[PDB]
Design a protein around this ligand. Structure first.
Ligand SMILES: COc1ccc(OCc2ccc(COc3c(Cl)cccc3Cl)cc2)c(Cl)c1
Ligand SMILES: COc1ccc(OCc2ccc(COc3c(Cl)cccc3Cl)cc2)c(Cl)c1
Lengths: 235, 68, 262, 272, 235, 272, 68, 68, 60
């Protein structure tokens, strides 16, 4: 017959190979498809949908519907943060379980811009201005509005348009970041402060909630498929 | 019945073959009658996320007020 | 109309005023061997009108208790005029047939007969010894045979009968009778027709064969709906079988064959 | 192996054409479709009969024999070629009276030590020799017949992928007969009853010959047994004259029956 | 020689493969074919031929010629069913052994329309009208003519044309049904009732039989070849 | 599987267009890009989403079963085909409600002597038979069912590269349902409670049939065990209707939960 | 001596290769002289069941009376 | 350097491929320089047996008298 | 290298196969043929020559 020479790698089974194989059920009459609504072509499409962030992971609130609610009040102006977060979308406990974080945990690298949308759920009679901020890594994490205001920030005025979006631009040294907590590929800090204060008239609730949402921008991508730690199996 | 596609060269060798010619193409031939036996081509398309990201009846511009 | 016909072959004519059309098995009309399908090289004999005519075999009687009847071709016609002579004088023979089953009653009688033409109609035997039926029993001639309502094993070791034991619901061969409709057939339902007519082409895995060693077709008649009349527990109506060989051609002439009998 | 027709929409009817009424006495089947008796919608039919073609129905390797050899006359075995030693393929073939096809034979060979703690042997090589009717049959696992100067032989090394060979249409007739309503002899008048007697439904005493299998290695006192499972697949298939399938258990090479004569269960006439 | 790489699946034996192999009897002079009557190209051709149904599987009638005979009589009109059946062509005991049922037992899926033909074997002097019905699954199986008449049905008038055909249309949720008794792919019920009554004059038999036949329509298909349970082998 | 858009340079703004403000009540996500809220530079984007395509996400052989056979009824085993016996592939598939694809099955077979100093056996051959729902299931490691005249079988020789076969889209619906909010039966008024009762979320009792595995060699008194690890890879993938992934431990074939109901850790609201 | 036929694609990948090109064709070459060695092409035809379903001499229409 | 010959089809599949096309042809390519390494083509000719059956000097007709 | 898949029948030895194999004596100068009388092309040529029949197989 035709002279052949077997090269190394022969008879192995690479779990990620892409070869042809014989069909065990030949000439099978396959049921044709129908146009079912909601077809998906890329996993990144799912990462671009707003998903609610479990921002309040305090012991009494974590693992309850309260982990999603961050409460505000009509107290006099303060320069202390309403919330603090680290830009580690796949590893920070508050981001790791969102739709975005879930997908990132099936990949080793991520790159791109993100956007955080906040919804004000107070009454119509409530007003206020808030400062949402993003500080690229390398300096002290902002602890006062004075430090936060020096980085990327959006001053949100509450009114008819109930929500406000802050885009966290892709500012990185490496071309891709890792989906694990690693200082070399650290992303920075997200924080919120009161710009003025929440003001309500009489006969109106003085405390109300805001909900946060996170999604990927159109320049977001992931690579190196890996296994997630979000699912296990004992015995 | 051979299908000749081109590869997306990542790391380039110090050759002109790394930038052109059949040296950056790959060849494919199906050996089985059933399409199930075929490998995946992996030349897969994308689409608009709008059906999920903006399943809104009355289309809105980001610059313009959402609640109008 | 679908109901009135006349069949003429040689010097014999058959008329019917209550037919239900006619069946041509597998849609093939009998024909002679073509040169492209020929095998024996000698000049064939084709008796034509002397052999291809209607021969009436013995009449059987249908009663409430009848289980069914069967015949084998060319066997049933081996003693029929010049057809039988040519069959025995030649080593090889080939023929098609026009089977006309006759059964008339009245408008107050009921019953339905299933008439099936089966290629290679092998029947089951009576012993624990496989394929033990002897030649003499397998080839009854014009009188044919009968179906039984149950299997009864022959135990006489000293003198085995070496006969068939065709159980009716098992179509005499280990298959369910209700599926016998996959074979060319007609039904003689007393309220509808008088007869059944089937034109059978020559069927075999060869162009020509030995008519004495091999039976090509089998005719099976089973009462699908039993005979019943007015109130006469006693009712008998005859079933006459008339068959005509077609396109007969024989090869390999020698001295006459005289098979062993009984 | 193709498409099925579309369903055309059908509305109400009030006519002298009555496709629902018929007369099965003629021997014909009424070719009705849904739209003949009910109002139908238009359906674009996409189902096909690709897998029920005569070819696809038989396109499977079925076991027809398990030949055994004990490398300690059993040093070699002979199997008379047939498809009736097993029931599954036989029943499928018998849906038809005649057939014509090529055959593909695949041989799966297994072996093992009879003793859990005794004996040892080097890798075995098997010889599967086809002995066409007429050729000399081996008397010893090592006599002159195993020279195969003309008989086709297959030498299989234990552990290698199953051996496989193709055989053309080898019948002496224009098609294989699944049923033969006749004898190989006609008893003549005057001859002794011992004379002219033959089996009913049997053709040649040796239709296709047989296979002679042996282990080529010199046998060691070690207790070993090997089994060659023969798988056959009809390819390039043509079949004639359909027959109802076997309903009761097979009882030999013929259509004989004896045991499972009551195949159907009980069920109430008016019970769903 | 030419460098090759062995892929997984090498040296295996797939019982359903389709490869070439060497011929053990080369240059063999093959006997040419002859035009034998009755050639078959597809198994579905056989499923389209009318085959008699063993409708009467009562203990005294099953496994005898009486299992095929369903008796009628000239009694006064009744609304009770003459017979009842389930549309499980491969599994219902009355359908599983017909030519259609036998073929379906070599396949895992079936789809298409079916037709039931009934032959009246009474005398010519006997008359009558019968109602043949088909009820798609999901409701109570019809027990009176009143319920049966609400589904697909054909009112058969007895006369010259001895037989009557009722087509059971393909009405299913799934694109293919299974050849086993399974509720998910259940087919419905077939039943027969007296519309008026069988009437005969004097000197005529008051009881007569009807025979049933079943065959597949031209839109019928099966898929996934499997082994039948209708044949076994002990030892 | 393509390119991402470039970043266009963006300067300062003072306008009545406010893309930063929105109203998520509508059910839509605000499609902002960096240049909407900050001054950007022009960046020529070279990153692509080639590896996150639905195809590349599933293009991996995942273990779905570990079938075990003890060659000393254990001489053969039967595995009901499913993807829910393991958790990893199951969780990935469940990101979608419906799917449609072809399957590639690779079988990794391992075996060993139970005893460190006892027994011996010749090389084993395995038979992996697929029993489609309806076909007879083997009662013994050597009964008639193993003739496979119609069922697809795979004969694997120990030590050979892993066996591998492809299966087409075999669903009876136009797509596979990962979730079925219903029953196979509707209990009717009047029938006994034992009647019309079925499992919630279950379709057919036997969806895809099962695999019957056995060692073909004659068993020796030696103590041996073999394990067939089944790996499946969806190829030619299409999926519909995304769903949030499983957050708590699986508790059966359904969406039932019981144990790890508190998946998230504690973290201070104002702690980075 | 290569024979190039097209496959009947069942499940389609999100590629244009799943709908056209040599990517939905398969190639075949016979290596043996004897036709018996060949595999089955499986491009098999069908026929009219009439020889079994209606082996009637005088052709009849379903709308028209069978018994005339 | 491929040689394409046609096969003498014995058993025919219910395909048109069984009657025509490259599906009834087989391909051959020699890999060795020495003709001894080649397989047998088996497209072998016949001849007149006369040199054995009738090695007669004065040719005779069967109808005509042999001894003249 | 080029991905291949071994089919059943591999490594077997069919006594009636027809394959190519390496030549053990390469570049050998083969002695040319001469036109020898009485060449045969088919075994049937021999079956067409009259051969005397041993008709009298009696014991003596
Ligand atoms: C939504 O996700 C799904 C849908 C269906 C699935 O299984 C369907 C299925 C049907 C038949 C066979 C049979 O395959 C085989 C054959 Cl023919 C021969 C030999 C071995 C095997 Cl293995 C295998 C799987 C799985 Cl695992 C996941
Ligand atoms: C109607 O169904 C039929 C008809 C004929 C059959 O057998 C005919 C037959 C004739 C010769 C050989 C010989 O084949 C072989 C050779 Cl050359 C070499 C090595 C091994 C074998 Cl195995 C094998 C089978 C069978 Cl099994 C079923």
């Amino acid at each position: 017959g035709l002279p052949v020479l077997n090269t190394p790698g022969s008879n192995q089974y690479l779990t990620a190979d892409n070869y042809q194989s014989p069909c065990a059920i030949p000439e099978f009459d396959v049921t044709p498809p129908i146009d079912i609504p909601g077809e998906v072509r890329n996993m990144m499409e799912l990462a671009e949908i707003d998903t609610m962030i479990p921002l309040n992971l305090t012991n009494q609130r974590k693992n309850t519907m309260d982990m999603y609610r961050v409460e505000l009040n009509d107290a006099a102006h303060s320069d202390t943060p309403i919330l603090c977060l680290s830009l580690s979308p796949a590893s920070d406990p508050r981001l790791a379980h969102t739709m975005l974080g879930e997908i990132l945990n099936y990949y080793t690298h991520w790159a791109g811009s993100l956007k955080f949308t906040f919804l004000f759920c107070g009454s119509m009679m409530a007003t206020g201005k808030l400062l949402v901020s993003y500080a690229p890594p390398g300096a002290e994490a902002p602890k006062s509005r004075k430090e936060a205001m020096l980085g990327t920030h959006v001053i949100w005025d509450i009114g008819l348009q109930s929500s406000c979006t802050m885009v966290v631009p892709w500012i990185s040294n490496t071309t891709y970041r890792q989906t694990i907590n690693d200082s070399f590929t650290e992303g920075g800090y997200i924080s919120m402060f009161y710009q003025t204060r929440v003001v309500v008239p009489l006969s109106t609730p003085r405390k109300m909630d805001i909900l946060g949402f996170v999604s990927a921008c159109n320049d977001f991508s992931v690579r190196l498929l890996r296994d997630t730690t979000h699912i296990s199996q004992e015995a | 019945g051979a299908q000749v596609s081109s590869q997306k060269v990542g790391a380039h060798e110090n050759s002109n073959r790394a930038y052109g010619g059949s040296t950056i193409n790959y060849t494919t031939i199906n050996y089985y009658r059933d399409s199930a036996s075929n490998a995946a081509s992996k030349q897969d398309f994308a689409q608009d996320p709008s059906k999920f990201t903006e399943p809104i009846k009355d289309v809105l511009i980001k610059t313009a007020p959402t609640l109008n | 109309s679908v109901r009135v016909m006349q069949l003429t072959l040689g010097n014999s004519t058959i008329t019917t005023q209550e037919a239900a059309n006619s069946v041509v098995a597998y849609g093939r009309w009998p024909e002679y061997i073509k040169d492209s399908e020929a095998n024996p090289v000698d000049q064939p004999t084709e008796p034509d009108v002397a052999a291809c005519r209607f021969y009436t075999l013995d009449t059987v009687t249908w009663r409430k208790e009848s289980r069914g009847w069967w015949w084998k071709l060319p066997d049933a016609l081996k003693d029929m005029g010049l057809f039988g002579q040519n069959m025995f004088y030649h080593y090889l023979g080939r023929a098609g047939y026009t089977v006309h089953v006759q059964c008339n009653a009245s408008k107050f009688h009921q019953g339905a007969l299933g008439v099936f033409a089966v290629p290679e109609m092998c029947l089951a035997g009576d012993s624990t010894t496989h394929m033990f039926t002897k030649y003499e029993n397998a080839n009854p001639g014009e009188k044919g045979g009968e179906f039984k309502g149950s299997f009864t094993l022959d135990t006489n070791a000293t003198n085995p009968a070496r006969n068939f034991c065709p159980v009716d619901y098992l179509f005499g061969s280990g298959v369910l009778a209700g599926n016998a409709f996959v074979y060319p057939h007609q039904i003689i339902n007393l309220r509808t027709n008088n007869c059944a007519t089937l034109v059978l082409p020559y069927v075999n895995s060869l162009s020509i064969d030995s008519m004495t060693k091999h039976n090509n077709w089998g005719i099976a008649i089973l009462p699908l709906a039993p005979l019943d009349f007015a109130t006469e527990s006693s009712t008998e109506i005859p079933i006459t079988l008339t068959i005509a060989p077609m396109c007969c051609e024989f090869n390999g002439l020698r001295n006459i064959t005289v098979p062993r009998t009984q | 192996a193709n498409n099925l027709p579309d369903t055309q929409s059908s509305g109400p009817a009030h006519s002298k054409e009555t496709p629902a009424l018929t007369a099965v006495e003629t021997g014909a089947t009424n070719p009705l479709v849904p739209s003949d008796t009910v109002q139908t919608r238009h359906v674009i039919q996409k189902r096909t009969r690709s897998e029920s073609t005569v070819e696809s129905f038989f396109a499977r390797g079925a076991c027809v024999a398990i030949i055994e050899v004990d490398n300690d006359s059993k040093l070699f075995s002979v199997w008379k070629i047939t498809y009736k030693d097993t029931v599954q393929l036989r029943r499928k073939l018998e849906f038809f009276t005649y057939s014509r096809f090529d055959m593909e034979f695949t041989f799966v060979v297994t072996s093992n030590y009879t003793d859990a703690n005794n004996g040892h042997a080097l890798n075995q090589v098997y010889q599967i020799m086809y002995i066409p009717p007429g050729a000399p049959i081996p008397g010893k696992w090592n006599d002159y017949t195993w020279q195969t100067s003309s008989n086709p032989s297959v030498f299989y090394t234990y552990g290698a992928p199953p051996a496989r060979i193709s055989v053309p249409y080898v019948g002496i007739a224009n098609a294989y007969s699944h049923f033969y309503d006749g004898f190989a002899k006609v008893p003549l008048a005057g001859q002794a009853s011992t004379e002219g007697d033959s089996l009913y439904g049997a053709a040649s005493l040796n239709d296709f010959g047989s296979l002679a299998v042996r282990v080529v290695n010199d046998h060691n006192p070690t207790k070993l047994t090997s089994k060659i499972r023969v798988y056959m697949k009809p390819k390039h298939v043509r079949v004639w004259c359909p027959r109802p399938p076997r309903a009761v258990p097979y009882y030999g090479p013929g259509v004989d029956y004896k045991d499972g004569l009551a195949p159907l269960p009980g069920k109430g006439l008016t019970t769903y």
